[PDB]
Symmetry: C2
Subunit: 239 residues, 2 copies
């Protein structure tokens, strides 16, 4: 169901920062807004015809929150009714997203913030359920089970593992689209899931698995040979 | 003395975020590192041959700090000796830059931090003196008087005023390069200095004044008619 504003790892900025979106009925829904991505959005026509923006947060690394404040300010000052919020951030309460934004001078008057512990929701309807994922110990990091147009989508966020319960859902056909942070590098303490490990953990329904957050060394040919899909920025974001 | 990685206002991202630099003797010195700019830097050869990075901070708006953490991580993990700090951040103590960086998961082990109240410094030699400036009520914001290769540089940061002592220095010929946040809009409570106000405040040495942080509406032809210079990204970034 998802298209991508960006799909690279933090240093692979030619693909943009990893961020998926849905645009429908004047609503722009996106997961994360990394440092590189506000400029990509502004150079595209993605915001044309958009009445309301919704941003769902996975964690606050710079390649996931670094330009959210730019987008908040732009939507507040320049979109629709000037100086009225038209962007809603959704985040787990424990992430303390407002404190991160306030550190950059982004105050609550500029956006709407909906926080939750377990789940929440936003003709456009979307639901999401938190899946805490391990990534770095410095930050609380999340993926999500997302329900949209009667499809079930798993979106890992940045993650170096997959819960056995989520794997079982995928194996049993209960996840229609499975977006997974995957990297080529394979090493102890990896903060991302290697392609090798992904191939060891998923045998069934590989055709529903989409590798994202791709590092510069990522071997797309090998990923496809194994039966996985590899995401790329949407054609809107490619020359 | 300065070249620019970017020179736009927050929404004018085709010019990049406002950030000046010097690259000399394996040292890359930059003022701020806004969200848009790590990608600009990575697409260029700016980091080629660089041994040490120094970032001086004016304030922590997203278009000034949003990708500093990306650059810290890249320099720590990918430049030179892997997992040894490559980058030194300079900031006034009151800015609390480490708390901002910690919020994005950027820990103190990944960079060197030098904080000060009044002044500090870094073959390559550079000195800076803090100039507190008004900009927004949410943040403590600063410009700087910078000494480099026997030239005196004023760099406003984001600012909606010029301190009288800095104006006098400019009028008296004591500032060689005067970089000023300037915008076209002119309104009560403006968080930047309008071109109109700049023209009312500065009469002598306008030829040493460089308008930066340019908004999408900025009238470069009018600024040049008034005798000011207009900054642009260095050709490396165009
Ligand atoms: Zn990431
Ligand atoms: Zn991350
Ligand atoms: Zn600014
Ligand atoms: Zn600012």
């Amino acid at each position: 169901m998802f298209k991508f504003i960006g799909c690279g790892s933090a240093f692979n900025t030619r693909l943009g920062n990893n961020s998926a979106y849905i645009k429908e009925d004047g609503i722009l829904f996106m997961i994360d807004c990394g440092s590189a991505n506000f400029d990509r959005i502004m150079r595209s026509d993605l915001l044309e015809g958009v009445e309301d923006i919704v941003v769902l947060m996975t964690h606050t690394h710079p390649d996931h929150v670094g330009s959210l404040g730019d987008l908040i300010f732009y939507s507040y000052f320049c979109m629709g009714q000037v100086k009225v919020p038209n962007l809603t951030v959704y985040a787990p309460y424990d992430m303390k997203i407002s404190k991160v934004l306030q550190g950059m001078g982004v105050e609550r008057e500029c956006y709407r913030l909906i926080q939750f512990d377990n789940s929440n929701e936003y003709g456009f309807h979307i639901k999401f359920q938190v899946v805490p994922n391990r990534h770095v110990p410095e930050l609380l990091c999340y993926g999500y089970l997302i329900t949209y147009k009667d499809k079930t989508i798993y979106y890992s966020g940045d993650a170096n593992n997959i819960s056995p319960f989520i794997l079982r859902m995928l194996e049993d056909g209960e996840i229609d689209y499975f977006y997974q942070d995957t990297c080529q590098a394979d090493y102890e303490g990896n903060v991302h899931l290697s392609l090798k490990k992904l191939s060891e953990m998923v045998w069934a329904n590989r055709d529903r698995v989409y590798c994202m957050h791709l590092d510069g060394g990522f071997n797309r040919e090998q990923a496809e040979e194994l039966g996985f899909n590899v995401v790329q920025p949407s054609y809107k974001f490619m020359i």
